[PDB]
């Protein structure tokens, strides 16, 4: 299938220039099923954490986006407690020109720079916007309990 050939090209790309503090690859015998790790960015409340994601490439990839969710609990305005990620390139702004490397870099950007004006968890979004110190101390505690 054209999806399988595509997924191999992107995995080879990731092996050419691996993005720092971001790795990903198939979980086992299923090339459509990947797992990723995001290292919590230093100078973020997530520093020191390792955040696991599941990635699934649908059969119609790359015309539909990869399905990506955190399996590590993370405290974030755009990520609910189920690991569902509200990010435009995973839905309405997906383009077959995008790669899983760009998707991972976008999630790393979301962790350091949330979109609280279009949140998935409005309470956390308000905490982030109006009380950043509180947002940080909760996200650090969650990093410590769940990502370490």
């Amino acid at each position: 299938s054209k999806a399988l050939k595509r997924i191999h090209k992107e995995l080879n790309d990731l092996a050419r220039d691996p993005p720092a503090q971001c790795s990903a690859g198939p979980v086992g015998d299923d090339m459509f099923h990947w797992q990723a790790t995001i290292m919590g960015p230093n100078d973020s409340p997530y520093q020191g954490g390792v955040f696991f994601l599941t990635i699934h490439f649908p059969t119609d990839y790359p015309f539909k986006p990869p399905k990506v969710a955190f399996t590590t609990r993370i405290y974030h305005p755009n990520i609910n407690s189920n690991g569902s990620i509200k990010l435009d390139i995973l839905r309405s702004q997906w383009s077959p020109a995008l790669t899983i490397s760009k998707v991972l870099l976008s999630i790393c950007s979301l962790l350091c720079d949330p979109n609280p004006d279009d949140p998935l968890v409005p309470e956390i979004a308000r905490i982030y916007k109006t009380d950043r110190e509180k947002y940080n101390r909760i996200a650090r505690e969650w990093t410590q309990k769940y990502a370490m």
């Binding site: 998935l120 309470e123 308000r126 109006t130």
Partner: protein, 76 residues
């Protein structure tokens, strides 16, 4: 009178409201107490999504009624 708004993270917001307050007004009061913009607010009561442009009495929200606050994804 006081109505309760239960959120998904487990908070219970108590609002001081009037039967004639509109849903738009209730959402504004939630924005006042919790900071959530109205366009992120989806209010549920007695099996119904509450529409802006009806009042609390339109849905028979009486004293100490309990509303549920969920995300309106269009605003998020």
């Amino acid at each position: 009178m006081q109505i309760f708004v239960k959120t998904l993270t487990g908070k219970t917001i108590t609002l001081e409201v009037e039967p004639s307050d509109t849903i738009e007004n209730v959402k504004a009061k939630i924005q006042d107490k919790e900071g959530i913009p109205p366009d992120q607010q989806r209010l549920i009561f007695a099996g119904k999504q509450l529409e802006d442009g009806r009042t609390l009495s339109d849905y028979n929200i009486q004293k100490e009624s309990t509303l549920h606050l969920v995300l309106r994804l269009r605003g998020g």
